[PDB]
């Protein structure tokens, strides 16, 4: 049981520690592989935060595209960080459900 995973829409991509998810096009770096072509190489990545091992895990997703990732339908900035809740919804200009476990 990983501290969160990404329902795509079939399989899951778990986010554990010190893990950087990235989510694209590109099979030789990406966790979880997108063929669509308006997807980028490397689209938007996928990470956690630990302050100490007894803590409560904050997750994060940071849009790096050139078309853009939607967050609960809105546009993210790119390259900036967005602080993720359980069941929150990523569409990558694709539907992936982030849940947590954690």
């Given at each position: 049981?990983?501290?969160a995973h990404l329902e795509v829409?079939?399989?899951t991509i778990p986010?554990?520690?010190?893990?950087?998810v990235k989510v694209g096009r590109n099979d030789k770096e990406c966790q979880l592989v997108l063929t669509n072509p308006s997807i980028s190489s490397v689209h938007c990545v996928?990470?956690?935060?630990f302050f100490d091992e007894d803590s409560i895990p904050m997750f994060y997703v940071k849009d790096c595209s050139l078309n853009?990732?939607?967050l609960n339908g809105l546009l993210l900035k790119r390259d900036k960080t967005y602080l993720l809740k359980h069941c929150?919804?990523?569409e990558l200009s694709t539907r992936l459900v982030f849940?947590?476990?954690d």
């Open positions: 049981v990983a501290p829409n079939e399989q986010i554990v520690k010190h893990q950087l996928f990470w956690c935060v853009g990732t939607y929150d919804v990523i849940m947590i476990n």
